[PDB]
Amino acid sequence: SSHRLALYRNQAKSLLTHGRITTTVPKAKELRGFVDHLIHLAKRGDLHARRLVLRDLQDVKLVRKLFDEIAPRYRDRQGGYTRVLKLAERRRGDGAPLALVELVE
Amino acid sequence: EAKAIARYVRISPRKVRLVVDLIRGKSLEEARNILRYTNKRGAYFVAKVLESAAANAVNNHDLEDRLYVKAAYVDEGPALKRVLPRARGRADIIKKRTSHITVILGEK
Amino acid sequence: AKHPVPKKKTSKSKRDMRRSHHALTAPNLTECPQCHGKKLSHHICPNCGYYDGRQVLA
Amino acid sequence: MKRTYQPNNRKRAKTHGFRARMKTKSGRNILARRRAKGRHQLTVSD
RNA sequence: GGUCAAGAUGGUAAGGGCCCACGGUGGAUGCCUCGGCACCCGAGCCGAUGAAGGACGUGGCUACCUGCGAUAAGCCAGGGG
RNA sequence: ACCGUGAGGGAAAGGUGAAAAGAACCCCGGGAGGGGAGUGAAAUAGAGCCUGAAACCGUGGGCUUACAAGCAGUCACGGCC
RNA sequence: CGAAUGCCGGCAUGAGUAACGAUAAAGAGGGUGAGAAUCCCUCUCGCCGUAAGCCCAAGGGUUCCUACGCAAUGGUCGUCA
RNA sequence: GACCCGGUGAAAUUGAACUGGCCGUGAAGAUGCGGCCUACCCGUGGCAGGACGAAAAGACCCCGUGGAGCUUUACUGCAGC
RNA sequence: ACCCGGUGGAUGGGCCGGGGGUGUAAGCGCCGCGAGGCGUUGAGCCGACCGGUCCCAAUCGUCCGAGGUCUUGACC
């Protein structure tokens, strides 16, 4: 829980910074679901949406950044603002199938 | 024909064995890719073994690509006698078990 | 507190069978997209970067 | 869990020790005992 | 030649049991010795002229082993050489 | 060496070679370790390196394995090698 | 000499099941490496905070820095100690 | 946590083992003796019943003209009075 | 292991429409020194439930897998 969020948090964040990232299979897939809907509000655009997405990622630089920055680029589609793509390698000791995901561009 | 062998290897006789059992009586290249993207440890170690084997092979035992593995086997050896907690009384060791790595490279 | 710990040695033989059911199977792999080499079915590689998109390096 | 080994310099040295050992009959005694009997060093030396 | 009814034998082994070949592992073994052990002869006190026993010490270049100790692997004098 | 506070207890570890001539150089490798080349009487004598057997783990083969009891087996007969 | 719950020493068992030593969490980015979940910088975040504070001493005693380097110790790694 | 993944990778008990139910039987509460009935080859997540399961050469017992503590008008003595 | 999907797709998530859940939001706005109140609002925000649409991601590839045993007889 506290954690599920936590993650969705740091990740959603750095993610917007980069447009893509490396996590593991699932990690990616849901980071997708949500960073995604965040994106959707980014679209919504306004006092309110802004409010929410910040409500979670917490910080202007990016908040608006996403919002005014790319929201545009995407304002048009129907979700899918994210594209998760399976990776070819596994983190050691471990054996875990990491993946790379991005905002579709 | 020529081969690949390394003692004082620090690894799972067994697991090691599955590694080889699988890249097995098969194509050099091919199995090579096998150690390449295959999981678990050793994979590496083994692929190394191969490398040295075929190098050894056309360099001074000689027709590169017609080579494959003609047999492969690992043999456990000197142990690593590990001293762990006393029976909160009498020590209890566990032996890392050094492993012997051997593989055959032979042309077609 | 070892209520039950094996009662008999285990039979070399059988023991091994037990182990037996256990089988190794090299990753299915498929040849590249065009970076021409063999690859982990479905993925870019230190050969590739493609798929349909140039994401990767070297 | 106050074992027993806590080494108190002051003390250990004190309660045992060359001098001490000489001090008494027994002491000196087993002192030579070892001396010859096996080499080694001696208490306080430790 | 094809169909159907019936009948009996076999090939396919994940691991496996026994048989062999070739390594590994483990150090038994035989033999070997600069070491004991055991009887017999020789020998039989050391000590403040701080002994027996260690302490910290030199080696050009360093733990350890040694031998000295401050004139530290050594100083003198006589016999061997 | 080591458990003991202490008094005290008290291991295990010898052998390569005739003598190192102990392994330049080349070869894969992060390396160790593996391959060549040279010693060589041999290095499956190669540095914990004589003789290094058993237990036990491996790798190839013969035979043998899915309506079947038993450690074992052993008497008969058959198939395959 | 099976044969004395034998002594010595190897060597297999369960078994690749059991455990990783406090449910105070992590994640991303780049850096270095032969190779890094397990090292370095860096940005999200969590946990102390009467302590998971710094201090005096007791005890240990070079463990400290700095350049090197990883075979074993480090209950995985490990270019980190 | 367990379970699947990758890294790591012990332990007591243990003659040996390819080890069914039966009704009976034997030393008298049998997987392996008899007659019979099901019964294919392997495994992992599990459930405890049996393998008189493990742990400990019964501490409740009795036996050895066994031991150690204490008791009184038990024997004998020593102490001190 | 079982079952249905594998871009000639709706399978998963996204979006979207719906319910169903909370109970009228963030803002300005007006009444009271304040506290707040009422309005804009039954709003706002919404986890699985029903069902759209190819926004995103099931690409592309590989393996293995039959041939029809021997003899009797009944038929064409």
Query: B7: closest CA among B82, B97, B67, B93?
Result: B97
Total domain count, chain D: 1
- B24 contacts B72 by C-beta, under 8 angstroms: yes
Give the best residue of A22, A84, A89, A105 to mutate against chain C (max C CB count within 10 A).
A89
Radius of gyration of chain C (CA): 23
Within 8 A of B41 by CB-CB distance, chain C residues are none
Residue type, B23: I
Experimental method reported for this structure: X-ray
How many Å from the CA of D29 to C1' of E40?
A: 35
Q: Is the CB of D9 under 7 A from strand G?
A: yes
Q: Which two tokens stand for residue C43?
A: 């993925």
Domain holding B77, by residue range, is 1-108
CA-wise closest residue to D35 among D21, D16, D24, D15? D21
Residue in chain B lying closest to C45 (CA): B37
The nucleotide closest to D10 (CA, C1' atoms)? G58
**Long-range contacts of the stretch B54-62 (C-beta < 8 A, 24+):** B54/B28, B54/B105, B56/B2, B56/B3, B56/B4, B56/B105, B57/B2, B57/B105, B60/B2, B61/B1, B61/B2
Q: What three-state secondary structure class fits D37? A: helix
Whether A100 sits inside 8 A of C45 (CB atoms) is: no
Torsion region of A69: left, alpha or beta (phi above 0 gives left; psi -120 to 50 gives alpha): alpha
d(CA D36, CA D31): 9
**What are chain A's domains?**
1-105 (3.90.1030.10)
Query: Which long-range CB contacts under 8 A does C29-37 form with residues at least 24 apart?
Result: C29/B33, C29/B37
Q: How far is C40 from chain B (nearest CA, A)?
A: 7
DSSP chain A: -HHHHHHHHHHHHHHHHHSEEEEEHHHHHHHHHHHHHHHHHHHH-SHHHHHHHHHHH--HHHHHHHHHHTHHHHTTS-S--EEEEEEEEEETTTTEEEEEEEE--
Largest CA distance in chain A: 47
Q: Are B102 and B75 in contact (CB under 8 A)?
A: yes
C48 close to B (CB below 8 A): no
User: Can you tell me the distance from the alpha carbon of A80 to that of A37, in angstroms, rounded to the nearest whole number?
Assistant: 9
Find the angle CA(B42)-CA(B44)-CA(B50) to the nearest 5 degrees.
105
* Domain membership of residue C11 as a residue range: 5-58
Domain that holds residue D4: 1-46
Question: What CATH number did the domain enclosing D35 receive?
Answer: 1.10.287.3980
Total domains present in chain C:
1
- In 10 A of CB B80, how many CB atoms? 11
Tokens of A55: 């409500």
Residue of C nearest to B39 (CA): C27
Provide the chain B residues 29-68 that lie in CB contact (below 8 A) with chain A: 39-40
Amino acid at B76: E
Question: CA C9, C14, C19: angle at the middle one, nearest 5?
Answer: 110
Residues found in chain A: 105
Report whether C45 contacts A100 (CB < 8 A): no
Kindly report the nearest CA distance between residue B42 and chain A, in angstroms. Answer: 12
